Design a protein around this ligand. Structure first.
Ligand SMILES: *[C@H](C)[C@H]1/C(=C/c2[nH]c(/C=C3N=C(/C=C4\NC(=O)C(CC)=C4C)C(C)=C\3CCC(=O)O)c(CCC(=O)O)c2C)NC(=O)[C@@H]1C
Ligand SMILES: *[C@H](C)[C@H]1/C(=C/c2[nH]c(/C=C3N=C(/C=C4\NC(=O)C(CC)=C4C)C(C)=C\3CCC(=O)O)c(CCC(=O)O)c2C)NC(=O)[C@@H]1C
Ligand SMILES: *[C@H](C)[C@H]1/C(=C/c2[nH]c(/C=C3N=C(/C=C4\NC(=O)C(CC)=C4C)C(C)=C\3CCC(=O)O)c(CCC(=O)O)c2C)NC(=O)[C@@H]1C
Ligand SMILES: CCC1=C(C)/C(=C/C2=NC(=C\c3[nH]c(/C=C4\NC(=O)[C@H](C)[C@H]4CC)c(C)c3CCC(=O)O)/C(CCC(=O)O)=C2C)NC1=O
Ligand SMILES: CCC1=C(C)/C(=C/C2=NC(=C\c3[nH]c(/C=C4\NC(=O)[C@H](C)[C@H]4CC)c(C)c3CCC(=O)O)/C(CCC(=O)O)=C2C)NC1=O
Ligand SMILES: CCC1=C(C)/C(=C/C2=NC(=C\c3[nH]c(/C=C4\NC(=O)[C@H](C)[C@H]4CC)c(C)c3CCC(=O)O)/C(CCC(=O)O)=C2C)NC1=O
Ligand SMILES: CCC1=C(C)/C(=C/C2=NC(=C\c3[nH]c(/C=C4\NC(=O)[C@H](C)[C@H]4CC)c(C)c3CCC(=O)O)/C(CCC(=O)O)=C2C)NC1=O
Ligand SMILES: CCC1=C(C)/C(=C/C2=NC(=C\c3[nH]c(/C=C4\NC(=O)[C@H](C)[C@H]4CC)c(C)c3CCC(=O)O)/C(CCC(=O)O)=C2C)NC1=O
Ligand SMILES: CCC1=C(C)/C(=C/C2=NC(=C\c3[nH]c(/C=C4\NC(=O)[C@H](C)[C@H]4CC)c(C)c3CCC(=O)O)/C(CCC(=O)O)=C2C)NC1=O
Ligand SMILES: CCC1=C(C)/C(=C/C2=NC(=C\c3[nH]c(/C=C4\NC(=O)[C@H](C)[C@H]4CC)c(C)c3CCC(=O)O)/C(CCC(=O)O)=C2C)NC1=O
Ligand SMILES: CCC1=C(C)/C(=C/C2=NC(=C\c3[nH]c(/C=C4\NC(=O)[C@H](C)[C@H]4CC)c(C)c3CCC(=O)O)/C(CCC(=O)O)=C2C)NC1=O
Lengths: 172, 284, 124, 162, 172, 173, 162, 172
């Protein structure tokens, strides 16, 4: 479990020198964008369950053979395995957005997902499609201004689109 | 897990009733709790009648004793050490006590580091006290409930790298865990600090080839080269047992192949001609 | 001429040496040196003499491999040579090409010029 | 799965003992029960197209808003009503499965495990399928001892919905 | 743990159609042969301990090097390991006869027996000879009529000879 | 590994290290008598090989229409051909096993990595089983009917063929 | 292993084609041949104790020094003669194996692979087992065409020793 | 492939300093014991084939089940596999004695032997016992003085007993 701060700390520990001035200048900018980071993380967990069901219907339409009998997500028991585990991507993504680093995302939700499926028979491609259907809706939920002050989050929202793309490409 | 549980051999654990200890005493339910303790803690080894620990049992009949204090007392007993502690490495044991007392394979290497400095300062008899007096034990096992395998379900808060270290631990219901061909050495001491999760291999007959351990200096899982193939799809296929032409042709059986897409179809045909069996191909 | 990417792969071990020789045979740094200067029947002979490490048997088999190269390309003829059953059994999977038996036989690098007798006559 | 044959097996496995007369008497209780249960399954398989047509129309007349309200969850569009006959067509399979197996195994493994888990997410009210099964309970047409056997699995599914 | 019934159920679940008429005609025959299945299973567990000792003496004569010193079954303890075990084949065989299916036999007593011996040093031949010496006596115990009504069960006894041959060939 | 019914008994009798018993030679003498019926059934499949690939393909791609629909796993003409070409490879290794009389050749070539290779490929395992299960009721039905041939009941031999497809089906889906 | 059934299989596998009539005719050549070969195996299994007693005594009379010379390799002690009947008792199994399999598969896989490799190390002269098999070749008591088929495997083992 | 010399070289390369005086004093001693190293290595390869057969008979007596049918070394083909191999321990041991370092022993004959057996079914104990039956005879061959000048090499013979014990304990 690493931060943006402890990323710089463990990197400066390996060289064994003091923290340089521009690194403190860069981390002072993270303090200024710190309140925008709580704007984006609070907006996802408020719309957490609404974006799980909405990405599930768009997945199970466009691959109809899953629900269909013989499919990997056919019975009501596996179906809940898949439907509820779509939160576990979002559980570890919004950890990484609030952390600002992809270390927590890597060793919990990324380290064995492409591992565990060969023994399970869950298609790798199907899982990737589902997370990529979360990404265009999770970015779109945090994008629109309604009752918040207007600011610029382009350089910060691209971190969120990188986090889902890190989660997608490591499996499929 | 069902139709993967038939292959992996974890269908008996998937629908396994909790034994408990309802507070009314009855000899039969107590007799069936005691088999449920010694089967999981001793890894389906058999207990003969001198090996029964009949004096352990007398306390169990009384109300004060709790399966939890009993499981402390079987692991501190010199019987359990004669099978597992003397004929094994200390890291293996730290890895092993999580399999019996907690039921899950070790998550991080840092959990392991804490145990060694506890084991040195306070002994092994206080180490097993720290496995039992854990919050993860008390949350899923009560005082009157036997430890069972929790490797399979979600047990929220698990890492999935530990989902596959559990399949490196026991090879089926049928196994002893002294009866795996790496028996003495820690199978996961390399995996815990390389921090990679190796390939799930299932047991025998359900899977045609059970004979795959991860090598020392083996091919990397994700690769960079296009590998001659015109279109980038590259797949990583490993073979388990090769008994093809001898001394110079096969210097090393169980070698991992990295083959791109367009020659994958001919590649499976060469491996079967070698008499080898494939445990895994993986896109990277 | 040497390729940096290919050399790196061997150290990593991602690519099998038999998959590595495919890089050098289908290298356009290699292709300009040998395919501009050599005819189709010499292109059979040079690939057998180096990759398979064997002399060609006769003349009629350079004719035999020739049709495949024109249709399959240079890469497709190399691909059919390396995935031949004869290459895969005798060299095996990870062993560098070499000449099999030379009790009293010319080294092939010395024996065969990079380019052919035809392309020399154009240079004069 | 759960079957009173395998219920006798898995019980004798944990004790590590042979099949005594305790586990053996559980077998013939399953055997002679099948002769009043297999033609209880034949009454449902012959009337397959009747009941899924009957229960689907019974749901719409009980809940008239489910045909009018706009939403994916409802049956306003055609693909909702196409998913309507799929769902109750999926219920009648497991009832015929659990009648033939003679236990509540297939009802456990294939229907009711996580059934209360999904209905919170897709806002499918379980009282929809309660009235769907209650139409099948009254209009199956089965009679006699066999009918009683087919009647419990319908009521066992209803208590799992609630 | 599967039956003959749940074999048909899980097979009919994958196709997703109703149970066909001849499948119910075949399962109605299993009801009629159901009382003969309790005839054969009750006869084995009554002669369980008598057929363990009798197959043990015929094994340890014809391979004398086992209880000879240096052998794998030499000392009293391991010897009881083998003796206790020969019931465990019979425990999981008579489960499969009463189940009428080989699914319970496969994932408990067959899934790791050929696995566990390379680490143990127990030879393959000893197990094969031992179980194949059970089979000709277990069939012979259930064959003879003494004080039972005469019937025909050759189509059912061949299932028992198949179950030991499944247990034998998966190890040796 | 490539095994027979004969070398099944040989490698089993090698492990015990004793001579071949008399009833084993009595059983193998029966395989000689049913040997000519085994060539009756194997010759009938390869004559109807290409006719049963196309006929099982249309019944598959009707009843799962989303495959050749766009976005499906068998949509484009290349993947489609591979799937079509493959359905022979089940039949190539099944009729090997019928003529062998043993499932060892079927296991280590066409069964050992099919349930393996699909997680990396995205192909649906369940659908494939259906495709092979649509071969089985037609392959049994082709060898069942008698036209211009001696009539005998091998029902004990055709059940081996229905076991071989069911071995090929259940190992994937 | 090698069997003219599987010889037809592995040949059709490398070409990647179906079992045509080329591979199919190799099957009935194996089938008919078994009826002259299975009672060729029955002549050896019935006479099992005769031949291993006969060939072992034939070796000692041919080579009289092998009973007198002190060494592990020889048959001076009792455990040498105990290992004597083990070795020729192991030859007659594979001949009955390769007669029943109908090919030289079990002779290849179980006997002659590395047979010239071990005899250089343990200084077992192969001419010992040459005279051992030649006694079995003359005294197996089999008659007719079936005996001739059985005999080739005796002569195929002799050429592998030399 | 490392020496005693290149052991010191690659160790002195990592510190990046010149070679110290006592390291050259220690390597000068290896020059003086260099002629005893050729005494011990020449004595093993002269008795190479005699110690393979002699350790094989003592192994296959004391574990008779390997020889017996069903065993891992039963047939004449596998038997040559094991017999041929026992030279390959001795091939890589006498490399390491003449090298004076265990680097050549480790990455060829030690790096995958405990690996390759789980897929092969060859037991660990048989391999361990055989190597350890070579060690007491290989030390005993180089120990006895017959027609050589008498010297002291107990500090050098213990390296050979360490090399077999390194080869034994890495497998079993
Ligand atoms: C001998 C004491 C035990 C034994 C050995 C045994 N080995 C094989 C087969 C192989 N052995 C090796 C070993 C190596 N190859 C290498 O490159 C290295 C590193 C230097 C080693 C150590 C290999 C690769 C093989 C492959 C097979 C071959 O011979 O080519 C066998 C044969 C197994 C088979 O299935 O045929 C055996 C028997 N077996 C015992 O029982 C002894 C205790
Ligand atoms: C058809 C019923 C199902 C299906 C199949 C499908 N297969 C592929 C691609 C490949 N399939 C193989 C298969 C084999 N190789 C072997 O050696 C053997 C044993 C003899 C078999 C069965 C291989 C090697 C490939 C890839 C490369 C190649 O074929 O040359 C695809 C392609 C998928 C893609 O995206 O490329 C498909 C679609 N598809 C279905 O939906 C059916 C269930
Ligand atoms: C066509 C008008 C006449 C004709 C053609 C014909 N040729 C062959 C066989 C071969 N043709 C070639 C030709 C080439 N090889 C090359 O590399 C190139 C330049 C890129 C050319 C033009 C070769 C090598 C052969 C040998 C076999 C091969 O195909 O690889 C045939 C087949 C003959 C046979 O198989 O014996 C035919 C029919 N022959 C005629 O009848 C026409 C008069
Ligand atoms: C093609 C799209 C697709 C996806 C993605 C999918 C997921 C999916 N994952 C499941 C289970 C699972 N999912 C996970 C994954 C996780 N659990 C953890 O502990 C980690 C936090 C996390 C991974 C990062 C695990 C470990 C199981 C097995 C749980 C169980 O067996 O109870 C199940 C139910 C059982 C199954 O068939 O294996 C489904 C249906 N199904 C689909 O059809
Ligand atoms: C942990 C609880 C917590 C939250 C949730 C929080 C959010 C938060 N977001 C803020 C600002 C802001 N937040 C945003 C966010 C965005 N604007 C856009 O148009 C984008 C689409 C989007 C990012 C994707 C912006 C633009 C501002 C402007 C002010 C600033 O830079 O902080 C501020 C500044 C102070 C204030 O608003 O009073 C707060 C409080 N502060 C807290 O203490
Ligand atoms: C019901 C499922 C099941 C099976 C099948 C099972 C078998 C089984 N046999 C074992 C041991 C053993 N199994 C045998 C069997 C034999 N050795 C020989 O040489 C003979 C030929 C043969 C008997 C005829 C022996 C001797 C041991 C003990 C080995 C030892 O103590 O070193 C072990 C290791 C644990 C222990 O021995 O305490 C298991 C798990 N356990 C189970 O839970
Ligand atoms: C094998 C046993 C089994 C059954 C029966 C089952 C039903 C089931 N029906 C669902 C949705 C649905 N169920 C229905 C059915 C109905 N809604 C109506 O309006 C009608 C009143 C009624 C039919 C009579 C519809 C229309 C949907 C889609 C709703 C949505 O997408 O939100 C869903 C969630 C999404 C899905 O994968 O399609 C499940 C899990 N799942 C199972 O595993
Ligand atoms: C040697 C070959 C052979 C067998 C195996 C055999 C069994 C056999 N058991 C029978 C009856 C029966 N067998 C049982 C057995 C039981 N029912 C239970 O519910 C108990 C759990 C169990 C005893 C523990 C019963 C209850 C009957 C009823 C008929 C009778 O009394 O014979 C009958 C009567 C005739 C028939 O069924 O056609 C047969 C044939 N007959 C044979 O010739
Ligand atoms: C519809 C169900 C059915 C089948 C399958 C059937 C087959 C069948 N094939 C037969 C004969 C035969 N079948 C073959 C076939 C061949 N021999 C070879 O070596 C060739 C490779 C191969 C042809 C390609 C031969 C040679 C015979 C000899 C007897 C005869 O001429 O009928 C006979 C003669 C009577 C008997 O065997 O009892 C039967 C029954 N009869 C039936 O009622
Ligand atoms: C299944 C086919 C098969 C055969 C036949 C076979 C023979 C065979 N005989 C051997 C030794 C032996 N072979 C013999 C036999 C003889 N020596 C004599 O003095 C007599 C002349 C002659 C018998 C007529 C003896 C006495 C030994 C022990 C020699 C020793 O230990 O050095 C050995 C080496 C040690 C062993 O494991 O016992 C093999 C491999 N191995 C095989 O796998
Ligand atoms: C039993 C324990 C033991 C050993 C091992 C032993 C070896 C040994 N080898 C020696 C000499 C020697 N050893 C060799 C051997 C060789 N030089 C080469 O270049 C050849 C390649 C190789 C022979 C193949 C030579 C050349 C000498 C020179 C001195 C002499 O002639 O003894 C000496 C002379 C005295 C000394 O070195 O201090 C000793 C001690 N003495 C012992 O007491």
């Amino acid at each position: 479990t690493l931060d943006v701060f402890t990323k710089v700390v463990s990197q400066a520990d390996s060289r064994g020198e003091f923290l340089s001035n521009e690194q403190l200048d860069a981390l002072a900018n993270v303090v200024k964008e710190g309140n925008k980071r709580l704007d984006v993380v609070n907006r996802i967990t408020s719309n957490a369950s609404a974006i799980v069901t909405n990405a599930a219907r768009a997945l199970f339409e466009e691959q109809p053979q899953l629900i269909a009998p013989g499919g990997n997500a056919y019975t009501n028991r596996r179906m809940a395995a898949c439907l509820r585990d779509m939160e576990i991507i979002l559980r570890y993504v919004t950890y990484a957005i609030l952390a600002g680093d992809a270390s927590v995302l890597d060793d919990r939700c990324l380290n064995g997902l492409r591992e565990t499926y060969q023994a399970l028979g869950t298609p790798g491609s199907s899982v990737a499609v589902g997370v990529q259907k979360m990404k265009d809706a999770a970015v779109g939920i945090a994008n629109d201004p309604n009752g918040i002050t207007k600011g610029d989050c382009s350089q910060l929202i691209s971190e969120v689109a990188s986090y889902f793309d890190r989660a997608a490409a490591a499996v499929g | 897990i069902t139709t993967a549980a038939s292959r992996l051999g974890t269908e008996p654990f998937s629908d396994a009733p909790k034994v408990e200890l309802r507070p009314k005493a009855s000899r039969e339910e107590v007799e069936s709790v005691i088999r449920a303790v010694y089967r999981h803690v001793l890894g389906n080894d058999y207990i003969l009648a001198s090996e029964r620990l009949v004096s352990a049992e007398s306390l169990l009949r009384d109300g004060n004793l709790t399966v939890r204090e009993f499981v402390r007392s079987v692991a501190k007993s010199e019987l359990y050490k004669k099978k597992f502690f003397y004929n094994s490495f200390q890291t293996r044991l730290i890895e092993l006590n999580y399999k019996h007392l907690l039921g899950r394979a070790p998550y991080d290497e840092s959990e392991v580091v804490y145990h060694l400095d506890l084991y040195q300062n306070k002994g092994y008899d206080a180490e097993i006290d720290s496995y039992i007096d854990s919050w993860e034990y008390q949350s899923n096992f009560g005082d009157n409930v036997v430890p069972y395998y929790r490797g399979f379900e979600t047990q929220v808060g698990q890492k999935t790298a530990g989902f596959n270290r559990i399949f490196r631990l026991y090879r089926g219901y049928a196994n002893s865990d002294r009866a795996q061909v790496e028996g003495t050495k820690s199978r996961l001491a390399r995996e815990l600090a390389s921090n990679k999760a190796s390939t799930i291999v299932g047991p025998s007959g359900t899977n045609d080839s059970w004979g795959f351990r991860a090598s020392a200096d083996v091919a990397p899982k994700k690769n960079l080269g296009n590998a001659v193939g015109e279109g980038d799809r590259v797949y990583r296929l490993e073979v388990t047992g090769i008994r093809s032409p001898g001394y110079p042709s096969v210097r090393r059986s169980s070698t991992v192949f990295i083959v791109p897409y367009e020659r994958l179809s001919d590649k499976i045909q060469q491996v079967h001609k070698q008499g080898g069996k494939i445990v895994s191909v993986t896109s990277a | 001429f040497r390729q940096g990417n290919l050399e790196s792969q061997l150290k990593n071990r991602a690519i099998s040496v038999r998959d590595f020789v495919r890089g050098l045979a289908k290298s356009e740094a290699f292709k300009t040196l040998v395919i501009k200067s050599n005819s189709n029947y010499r292109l059979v002979e040079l690939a057998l003499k180096r990759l398979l490490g064997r002399a060609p048997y006769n003349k009629d088999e350079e004719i035999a491999w020739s049709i495949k190269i024109a249709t399959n390309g240079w890469d497709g003829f190399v691909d059919a040579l390396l995935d031949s059953e004869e290459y895969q059994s005798n060299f095996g999977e990870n062993i560098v090409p070499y000449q099999r038996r030379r009790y009293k036989d010319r080294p092939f690098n010395l024996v065969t010029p990079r380019y052919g007798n035809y392309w020399r006559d154009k240079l004069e | 799965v759960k079957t009173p044959i395998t219920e006798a097996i898995a019980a004798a496995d944990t004790q590590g003992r042979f099949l005594g007369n305790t586990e053996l008497q559980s077998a013939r209780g399953r055997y002679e029960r099948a002769a009043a249960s297999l033609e209880a399954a034949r009454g449902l398989t012959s009337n397959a197209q009747r009941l899924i047509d009957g229960a689907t129309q019974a749901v719409y007349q009980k809940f008239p808003y489910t045909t009018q309200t706009p939403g994916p969850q409802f049956a306003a569009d055609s693909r909702g009503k196409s998913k309507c006959a799929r769902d109750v067509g999926h219920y009648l399979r497991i009832i015929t499965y659990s009648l033939v197996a003679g236990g509540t195994g297939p009802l456990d493994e294939y229907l009711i495990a996580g059934l209360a888990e999904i209905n919170s997410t897709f806002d499918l009210s379980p009282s929809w399928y309660v009235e769907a099964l209650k139409h099948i309970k009254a209009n199956h047409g089965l009679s006699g001892q066999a009918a009683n056997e087919a009647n419990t699995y319908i009521d066992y599914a209803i208590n799992a919905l609630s």
